[PDB]
Amino acid sequence: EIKKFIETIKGTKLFTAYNTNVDAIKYLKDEDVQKLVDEFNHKDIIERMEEYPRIIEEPLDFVARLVHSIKTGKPAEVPIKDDKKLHEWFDRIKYDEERMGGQAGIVSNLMATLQIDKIIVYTPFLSKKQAEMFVDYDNLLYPLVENGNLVLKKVREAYRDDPIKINRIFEFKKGLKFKLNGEEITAKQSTRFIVASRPEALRIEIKDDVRKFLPKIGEAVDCAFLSGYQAIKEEYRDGKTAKYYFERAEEDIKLLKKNKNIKTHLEFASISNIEIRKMVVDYILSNVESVGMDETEIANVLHILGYDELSNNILKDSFIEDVIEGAKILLDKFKNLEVVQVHTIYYILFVCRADNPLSKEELEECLEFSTILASTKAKLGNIRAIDDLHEGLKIPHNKYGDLLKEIAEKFNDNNYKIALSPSRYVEKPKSTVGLGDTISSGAFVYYVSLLNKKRM
Ligand SMILES: Nc1ncnc2c1c(I)cn2[C@@H]1O[C@H](CO)[C@@H](O)[C@H]1O
Ligand SMILES: OC[C@H]1O[C@H](O)[C@H](O)[C@@H](O)[C@@H]1O
Ligand SMILES: [Mg+2]
């Protein structure tokens, strides 16, 4: 059964862009949080939470948004300003581990670990330290231009004297507790709060040298997993703007498809700036075949598209019926879209049109594979070998499963195909960062694999 999953994906080839970084991870304990809040007047924390800062300019902004994430039990990603004083305050924190971060980095590593035929990863900065966090696999490749020719080089050997990007990941578990202004706050969910660096010099783009060869890169692969748009700023000091990078990124997608119509996937993320979030919808979502979102992310998209009541209902009640309705709206709105994927702590869902070449059972097989990856990663923290997948396979489907599945399954009809795999939930997960990327990329690569297998 693991064998069979691995065989099925082996011939699939993947391009991924644009974001790789170091994720410096802190596993928060009660006392770590208590110490963070005790550095401030508890009243100042409550007042700053009322303001809801969407960018971290001083440590109090961080503490406010972290408490908010713990209290609501919801993940968030919030950018920092680049100043020294703030950067240094964050360095005094003792991190427990460093690992590959960023969608394109995590997905690359996963697919190298799973031993698919080829992975081509692009990111603009590739320092030695960064490159050496990639998995050692001869067919995990980075595109270089040498004497006017495209060279695909093993990523770990392709490094140069580039700067390094570091994001800071604050992981907490269900049951974590602390006191703020007399109130004991207890985490009801295990999740993570991300402090996002957006270094001025690091652009979400393919640089001109490589960009000339995007069509050839597309022909070399079967599909593309794209993300990183979440770090685009409205303005750069050199006068470039979000619009410039978004127009360019939309064109990247057409260039990739120019000589081969590969499947492309957008992975959404928590995007603090609502103007950037809108641009991801307008420029990227409109041009891809697959989209991966959590529940909050689909609500956010729906709100951008003017479906305010449905989006707020999703946020409020998380009814699977409402999520499905939202997915259908996306399918109806975006003709290029073939599959809408939503993942929550309870399930992963695919919504497709009836005309999709895959059957409902084949869609299910994609999701069942993906859930094994995600639960393995939740248990161990990392998927280091194919053999690790036996961990995920031991964990049973969560107790809401038959029920969620039953509800969703009734929306299969003449117009739409729906598949749902309940999560295989682990009470005390080692970590949560990258679980979505793991599930989304697994499901998508499996989907592409089954399409191509059927086409022959
Ligand atoms: N504690 C956990 N234990 C096992 N699996 C987990 C989690 C959590 I937190 C999330 N997930 C799985 O990751 C996917 C992305 O949220 C979800 O869809 C889900 O499959
Ligand atoms: O999916 C997890 C990744 O996604 C995010 O968008 C973060 O920027 C990155 O730090 C993290 O590794
Ligand atoms: Mg995600």
For 296-319, give the DSSP string. HHHHHHHHHTT-HHHHHHHHHH--
For ligand 3, the distance from its centroid to the CA atom of residue 419, given in whole angstroms, is 20
Is residue 154 classed as helix, strand or coil in its secondary structure? strand
CB 66 within 8 A of CB 48: no
Q: What are phi and psi of 395, to 5 degrees?
A: -85, 125
375 token code pair:
């639960």
CB 74 within 8 A of CB 189: yes
**Ligand having the closest approach to the CA of 345:** 1
Q: Which atom of ligand 1 is nearest to the CA of 344?
A: 18
| CA–CA gap between residue 417 and residue 408 (Å, rounded) | 10
What are the pocket residues of ligand 2 if the criterion is a CB atom closer than 6 Å to any ligand atom? Answer: 21, 23, 77, 101-103, 106, 167, 194, 196, 230, 269, 433-434, 436-437
Neighbours of 286 (CB within 10 A): 16
DSSP per residue over 28-79, as a string?
--HHHHHHHHHTS-HHHHHHHHHH--SSBSSHHHHHHHHHHHHHHT--EEEE
For ligand 2, the distance from its centroid to the CA atom of residue 101, given in whole angstroms, is 6
| CA–CA gap between residue 440 and residue 456 (Å, rounded) | 25
For ligand 1, the distance from its centroid to the CA atom of residue 30, given in whole angstroms, is 22
Chain centroid, CA 27 distance in Å: 20
Is 388 labeled as catalytic in the residue annotation? no
Q: Which atom of ligand 2 is nearest to the CA of 105?
A: 12
Please tell me the total number of residues recorded for the chain in this structure: 456
Is residue 419 classed as helix, strand or coil in its secondary structure? strand
| CA–CA gap between residue 316 and residue 292 (Å, rounded) | 20
139 token code pair:
């067919």
| CA–CA gap between residue 70 and residue 304 (Å, rounded) | 26
**Domain architecture of the chain: domains with CATH:** 1-19+102-162+199-456 (3.40.1190.20), 20-101+163-198 (3.30.1110.20)
Q: Which residues contact 135 (CB under 8 A, 6 or more apart)?
A: 108, 109, 112, 113
Neighbours of 405 (CB within 10 A): 20
CA-nearest residue, atom 12 of ligand 2: 101
